[PDB]
Design a binder for these strands. Structure first.
Length: 77
DNA sequence: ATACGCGGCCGCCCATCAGAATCCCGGTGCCGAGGCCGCTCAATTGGTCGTAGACAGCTCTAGCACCGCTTAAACGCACGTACGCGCT
């Protein structure tokens, strides 16, 4: 909770809306998703799972089909 | 002129003397251990030095084990085609 509150306060306080990578094991990823949405619902929590097609989903959701649209910030790898 | 005799010939069983052939004992040639041997030059003997390599200490790689997330590869089965192989 201190990490989520520190990231939220750092984004909405010091104006640091940039992408922040938070590596979390696969077993704890749904727990950090439920806690993350329960304590900070205003921020998305699109994590990174899968193997092949899910990688294509994360890549098609990452940027737009053009030769730089950041639609995320916090993820779990 | 007319009737009796016989003469060697011959099948016969029956006798004598030599030759052929099997068994009782044989010499001969070939092979392989033996013996002999002898001049002698390679192993053995007695001996020194030194150095490889056994051995104990040590540390410091890498071979093992073990686990779990991820997924490519193996599995087993279903269906048919195009070869193995049999015949002529």
């Amino acid at each position: 909770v201190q990490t989520v509150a520190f990231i939220s306060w750092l984004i909405f306080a010091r104006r640091q809306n940039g992408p922040h990578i938070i590596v979390v094991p696969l077993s704890t990823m749904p727990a950090w998703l439920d806690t993350f949405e329960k304590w900070a619902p205003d921020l998305n929590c699109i994590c990174y799972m899968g193997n092949q097609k899910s990688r294509d989903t994360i890549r098609e959701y990452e940027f737009y089909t053009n030769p730089k649209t950041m639609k995320f910030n916090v993820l779990l790898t």
